[PDB]
C-alpha cells in the first residue's frame, strides 16, 4: 500500500509545515507537524489543560470507537528549542493520505509548553525518526512509519517541501516525476536515533567548493539550517552588513541585501539553496534588520539540516534494514 498527503506552510516564512492526519473512528482530522527529528505522535486533546489550548483542533478519544487507553503508560518530551509536552497514551486508528495503521500509539497531551499554545495552526507532531527515541514509559511505542513499514510497497517515505508553497509527503513509493536528474544516496547512522548523515562539503554563492565532512541530521521539524561556526561565518562574511547579534540570538542582515546561495554536498552531488530561502524577514515588525536562515550549531551540539535545506531538494528517507537518505534536485 501507499499514502500521499499535501503539506502546507503555516505562515509566510515557512516556519513549519502541517499535514492533515485522520485519527479515530469516525475520523477526527488534525493538522500535524511531521518531524523526522523526533519519534512521538502526540496531539492536543480533550485532556489538555484548557488554559493551554488556544485555537488548536483537539482529539477527543471518548468519541472514537477504536480508541483504547494504554493502561499506565505516560510520555514526556523536551525538544532542542526548549519546548515540551506530556500526558497519557491511547491506541487508535491513524490514516495519512489513504495509508491506514491500526493500533498506533496516540499520545494525548495533558500539558504543553507555551510555544505550542501560541502556535494555533499546529495540532500536534508526528514523529518520523527511529523508534528508539520514543518517550512512552514503561513500554516504548513504535512510530507511524515503523508500524506501516511491513505493508508499504517500499519501506520509504519522501519529503518534498515547498518554498512559500504546498508540498507532499509520500509513503511507500518514489514519485519519479517530482525531481530532476538522479537521486544520490548516502549512508545513515542510527546510533543516536536520528536520520544522521555526513555532508561532503559546502560552497558560498559562486565560490570554490570546500570538501569537508559535516555530520548532521535531516530534520523536517526544525526551521533553519544549523551548521558549524566556521561554515556559518564564511557564509555571512559575503553579506554586506551582516553580523552576529547576541540580543537577537544569531546572525542578522540588512533587509535590503541580496543573499548568496548556499551549496551543500551529498556524496559527489550538490544541492543548491537559493539565497531567497535564507531570508527570514524582519526581526520585529517594521525593522530593517532581517533574520538569517543559516545559523551556528555551536550552542546546540549537533548540526541540523532543517527545512531551509530540505526544501531545496527531493528527500528520500529509506527505512530499509540498512537505512539510507537520498537527495535529488528539483
Ligand atoms: N525536530 C526534533 C529535534 C529537536 C531537537 C534536536 C536537537 F537539537 F537535539 F538536535 C533534534 C531534533
Ligand atoms: N523540533 C520539534 C518542534 C516543532 C515545532 C515546535 C513549535 F514551533 F511548534 F514550538 C517546536 C519544536
DSSP letters along 142-187, please?
Answer: --HHHHHGGGSSSSEEEEE--SSS-EEEEES---TTSSSS-PEEEE
Q: Do 41 and 143 contact (CB within 8 A), yes or no?
A: yes
Q: 3-class DSSP state for residue 214?
A: strand
Examine residue 151 and say whether the peptide bond preceding it is cis (omega within 30 degrees of 0). Answer: no
Q: Closest residue (by CA) to atom 9 of ligand 1?
A: 80
The owner of cell 560552497 is: 203
Q: Do 102 and 68 contact (CB within 8 A), yes or no?
A: no
Give CA–CA dist 179/165, Å, rounded. 16
C-alpha cell at 253: 542582515
Give CA–CA dist 305/299, Å, rounded. 15
Helices (H) and strands (E) in the chain, counts: 4, 24
Give CA–CA dist 152/96, Å, rounded. 13
Q: Closest residue (by CA) to atom 11 of ligand 1?
A: 37
Q: Is the dihedral of CA 148, 149, 153, 157 positive or negative?
A: positive
Ligand 2 centroid vs 80 CA: distance in angstroms? 9
DSSP state of 33: E
Catalytic residue among 35, 146, 160, 219: 35
Ligand 1 centroid vs 36 CA: distance in angstroms? 9
Give CA–CA dist 95/102, Å, rounded. 9
- Bridge-based pairing state of the strands 156-160 and 314-318: antiparallel
Q: 3-class DSSP state for residue 290?
A: strand
Catalytic residue among 64, 85, 86, 199: 199
Ligand 1 centroid vs 79 CA: distance in angstroms? 6
**Which residues neighbour 330 within 8 Å (Cβ) at sequence distance 6 or greater?**
160, 178, 179, 180, 312, 313, 314
To the query of whether residue 71 is one of the catalytic residues in this protein, the response is no
Give CA–CA dist 109/133, Å, rounded. 18
Q: 3-class DSSP state for residue 270?
A: strand
For this PDB entry, the determination method is: X-ray
Give CA–CA dist 176/182, Å, rounded. 9
Which segments of 195-280 does DSSP mark as H helices, in order?
Answer: 229-236
Give CA–CA dist 181/263, Å, rounded. 17
Q: What ligand is nearest to the CA atom of residue 16?
A: 2
Residues shown for the chain: 330
**Which residues neighbour 50 within 8 Å (Cβ) at sequence distance 6 or greater?**
none
Q: 3-class DSSP state for residue 252?
A: strand
Give CA–CA dist 152/228, Å, rounded. 37
Give CA–CA dist 190/197, Å, rounded. 9
Give CA–CA dist 208/242, Å, rounded. 21
Specify the ligand 2 atom closest to the Cα of 219: 1
Q: What ligand is nearest to the CA atom of residue 299?
A: 1
**Which residues neighbour 39 within 8 Å (Cβ) at sequence distance 6 or greater?**
127, 128, 129, 130, 131, 132, 133, 134, 135, 143, 193
Give CA–CA dist 149/261, Å, rounded. 37
**Which residues neighbour 158 within 8 Å (Cβ) at sequence distance 6 or greater?**
168, 169, 170, 174, 175, 178, 314, 315, 316, 317
At how many Å resolution was this determined?
Answer: 1.8
- Name beta bridge partners: 294: 225
Which segments of 243-298 does DSSP mark as H helices, in order?
Answer: none
Give CA–CA dist 172/155, Å, rounded. 6
Q: 3-class DSSP state for residue 292?
A: strand
Q: 3-class DSSP state for residue 36?
A: coil
Q: State which H helix or E strand residue 271 sits in.
A: strand 269-273
To the query of whether residue 35 is one of the catalytic residues in this protein, the response is yes
Give CA–CA dist 114/97, Å, rounded. 30
**In terms of Cα–Cα distance, which of 225, 239, 243 is closest to 312?**
225
DSSP state of 194: S
Q: What is the largest CA-CA distance in the chain?
A: 60
C-alpha cell at 31: 493538522
Amino acid at each position: 500500500s501507499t499514502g500521499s498527503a499535501t503539506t502546507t506552510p503555516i505562515d509566510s516564512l515557512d516556519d513549519a509545515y502541517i499535514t492533515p492526519v485522520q485519527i479515530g473512528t469516525p475520523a477526527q482530522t488534525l493538522n500535524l507537524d511531521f518531524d523526522t527529528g523526533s519519534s512521538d505522535l502526540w496531539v492536543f486533546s480533550s485532556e489538555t489543560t484548557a488554559s493551554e489550548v488556544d485555537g488548536q483542533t483537539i482529539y477527543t478519544p471518548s468519541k472514537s470507537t477504536t480508541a483504547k487507553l494504554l493502561s499506565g503508560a505516560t510520555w514526556s518530551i523536551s525538544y532542542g528549542d526548549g519546548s515540551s509536552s506530556s500526558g497519557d497514551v491511547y491506541t487508535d486508528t491513524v490514516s495519512v493520505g489513504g495509508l491506514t495503521v491500526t493500533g498506533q500509539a496516540v499520545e494525548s497531551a495533558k500539558k504543553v509548553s507555551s510555544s505550542f499554545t501560541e502556535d494555533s495552526t499546529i495540532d500536534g507532531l508526528l514523529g518520523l525518526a527511529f523508534s528508539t527515541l520514543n518517550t512512552v514509559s514503561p513500554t516504548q511505542q513504535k512510530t507511524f512509519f515503523d508500524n506501516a513499514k511491513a505493508s508499504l510497497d517500499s519501506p520509504v517515505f519522501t519529503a518534498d517541501l515547498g518554498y512559500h508553497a504546498p508540498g507532499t509527503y509520500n509513503f511507500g513509493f518514489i514519485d519519479t516525476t517530482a525531481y530532476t536528474g538522479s537521486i544520490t544516496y548516502t549512508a545513515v547512522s542510527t546510533k543516536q536515533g536520528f536520520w544522521e548523515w555526513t555532508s561532503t562539503g559546502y560552497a558560498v554563492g559562486s565560490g570554490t567548493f570546500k570538501s569537508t565532512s559535516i555530520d548532521g541530521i535531516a530534520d523536517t521539524g526544525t526551521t533553519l539550517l544549523y551548521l558549524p561556526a566556521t561554515v556559518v561565518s564564511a557564509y555571512w562574511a559575503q553579506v554586506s552588513g551582516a553580523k552576529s547579534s547576541s540580543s537577537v540570538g544569531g546572525y542578522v542582515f540588512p533587509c535590503s541585501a541580496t543573499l548568496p546561495s548556499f551549496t551543500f554536498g551529498v556524496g559527489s552531488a550538490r544541492i543548491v539553496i537559493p539565497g531567497d530561502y535564507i531570508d527570514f524577514g524582519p526581526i520585529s515588525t517594521g525593522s530593517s534588520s532581517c533574520f538569517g536562515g543559516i545559523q551556528s550549531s555551536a550552542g546546540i551540539g549537533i548540526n541540523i539540516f532543517g527545512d531551509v535545506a530540505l526544501k531545496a531538494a527531493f528527500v528520500v528517507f529509506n527505512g530499509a534494514t540498512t537505512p539510507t537518505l537520498g537527495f535529488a534536485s528539483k
